[PDB]
Amino acid sequence: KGCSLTKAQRDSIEVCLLSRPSMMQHLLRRLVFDVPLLNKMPLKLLTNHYERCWKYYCLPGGASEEELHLSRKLFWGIFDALYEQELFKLALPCLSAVAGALPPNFNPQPVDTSNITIPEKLEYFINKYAEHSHDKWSMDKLANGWIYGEIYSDSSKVQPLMKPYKLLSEKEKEIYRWPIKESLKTMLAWGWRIERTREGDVDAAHGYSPRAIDMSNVTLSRDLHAMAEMMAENYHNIWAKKKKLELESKGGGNHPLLVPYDTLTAKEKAKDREKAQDILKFLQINGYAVSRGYFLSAASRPLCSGGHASNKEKEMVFCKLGVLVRHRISLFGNDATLHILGQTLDARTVMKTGLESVKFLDNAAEDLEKTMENLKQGQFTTTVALLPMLSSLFEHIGQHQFLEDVQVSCYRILTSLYALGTSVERQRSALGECLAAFAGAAFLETHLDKHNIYS
Amino acid sequence: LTEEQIAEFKEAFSLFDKDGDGTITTKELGTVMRSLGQNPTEAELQDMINEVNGTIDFPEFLTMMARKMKDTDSEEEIREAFRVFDKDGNGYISAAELRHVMTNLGEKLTDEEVDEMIREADIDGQVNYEEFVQMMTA
């Protein structure tokens, strides 16, 4: 389906460009989830729709800001694998300026559950935790007010399982201890440890009476809730596998709720979060610490500058579009603007001097716009300017032997001089010697550059 | 579709047709187009198969390959009919000479259609014919 897929793509792009950015943030979650497989082409069309949303929300909107920075980092790391790459790269410039405006077939993956045992110092706590979970369960049933009875009737206010803690045997506790044990094993198998800390702690009805510690006021911190969310996502993956192993046991297909995780409602995540935090809230009641056992693009600019140095070392052997992508990202950062910026300037001078004498063709054309954007970045933002002037003189000696590469090197020298003189003259004497060497025999443009960018 | 083109299409079909009823089988579409020298994407091939019991036959095969030919004919002929005029080779036709080259025979209508040209053509005045393509070919 060629035109059918293109019509679906136009429908998605128009329904996103007509819509405010809260739903666009919810869909940008799925765009970041799909961005990891960019390097197929229509997943990159979803990435182009996300680029449209970034170009629309760069002003006011440019929760999910860290998600956008993470998606920028992951798309920059996936785009450096290898037309279509030029399309994603030209989309990446406005997305990079938007991130600088910020800076201004499902397959679940469960784990083995029954191969690592539990130390018994937590089994001294299991005897109270399983008790407390069943007490909170019977307390929630006392919110309805259930009464113990014999015949299992759900209409006569009868629960036949409302028996006390003394009348519970081993295998009558094992039915509720099985998710407890096989959740503690998923916590403890990965290398998570919960050590020692300080000590810790409307009318009723008939049956069992829990004076349970109130689970409606307990809250962890952000990384502890992130660990809880990882455990809840694991629990939902196990439940999704438990349903996938039964929807094909009769002989049919699948249920449409097999989606990526970020496209469900709130209660379906909140139930597994409650099951993950029945442990953690009661650890906070007893006072047991659950342990593990913007500036993001500004930080990623130095790694991108190192990658630009590597691309300047080995780009002119096909990778000219990869060099132009980093040049356009540097242009977008120049439209998005501090010693790390000085390190990026030194790495940009290294990227200029890495292929000095070999100045394939479109990279050399776009390098003039990259140098003008670097001069703009110098107009946007320590004594290495003398040695870089000699490196630029060597680049001019490598670019002045050759069509109008001599005039392009003179325009690049005028770009550097406009960046430096808007806010030592041995290299100026070398420029005068170059003018006296190759003036009288492209050269009038070099004269118009040298008579005005001397300051 | 010409003498030679319809001759070639019938020759290729009847050479790939064996039984003598006018129907080749379903998987012969890519075979007959690559015998004619055409290798598109598979989605277009599947659309052309499902546009045709499971017996791909003569009529709309002729019609679809007519459409595939008239696309390239549209490109080449909208190139050359403006290559007639505009003797410096840029596609920039002036507005007065657009009035001249628009009131051709055949249609020969009044100031309605050339008013439709000049009201929206992009005029700076030199007019490139891509604006005329995107206007007049819907």
Please tell me whether residue A133 adopts helix, strand or coil conformation: helix
Please tell me whether residue B23 adopts helix, strand or coil conformation: strand
Nearest chain B residue to A6, by CA: B43
Would you say A376 and A334 are in contact if contact means Cβ atoms under 8 Å apart?
yes
Fill in the amino acid letter for A388: P
Of A375, A317, A322, A382, the residue nearest A348 (C-alpha): A375
Q: Does A40 touch chain B (CB under 8 A)?
A: no
Nearest chain B residue to A1, by CA: B43
- Who contacts A305 (Cβ-Cβ below 8 Å, separation ≥6)? A343, A344, A347, A348, A351
Distance CA A313, CA A350 (A): 9
Distance CA B86, CA B81 (A): 10
Please tell me whether residue A123 adopts helix, strand or coil conformation: helix
Instruction: Count helices and strands (H / E) in chain A.
Output: 17, 2
Structure tokens at A13: 């792009």
Structure tokens at A290: 């659950």
Q: Does A2 touch chain B (CB under 8 A)?
A: yes
Size (chain B), residues: 138
How was this one solved? cryo-EM
- Who contacts A251 (Cβ-Cβ below 8 Å, separation ≥6)? none
Q: Which residues of A touch B43 (CB under 8 A)?
A: 1-2, 5
Distances (CA, A) of A376 to A82, A311, A370, A381: 29, 22, 10, 9
Please state the residue numbers annotated as binding site of B for Ca(2+). 17, 19, 21, 23, 28, 53, 55, 60, 86, 88, 90, 92, 97, 122, 124, 126, 131
Instruction: Count helices and strands (H / E) in chain B.
Output: 7, 4
Beta bridge partners of A158: A147
Distance CA A413, CA A435 (A): 13
Q: Does B105 touch chain A (CB under 8 A)?
A: no
Would you say A435 and A393 are in contact if contact means Cβ atoms under 8 Å apart?
no
Q: Which residues of B touch A1 (CB under 8 A)?
A: 43, 46-47
Domains of chain B with bracketed CATH: 2-71 (1.10.238.10), 72-136 (1.10.238.10)
Distance CA A231, CA A240 (A): 14
Fill in the amino acid letter for A79: F
Burial label for A149, CB within 10 Å (0-12, 13-18, 19+), is middle
Which value in Å is the resolution of this experimental model? 3.6
* Sole residue written with tokens 């051709």: B104
* Sole residue written with tokens 């920075």: A69
Q: Residue B103: what are its φ and ψ, rounded to 5°?
A: -85, 55
Looking at beta carbons, which pairs linking A167-174 to residues 24 or more positions away fall under 8 Å?
Answer: A173/A130
End-to-end CA distance of chain A: 61
Nearest chain A residue to B47, by CA: A1
Beta bridge partners of B24: B56
Of A90, A54, A48, the residue nearest A69 (C-alpha): A54
Distance CA A178, CA A343 (A): 56
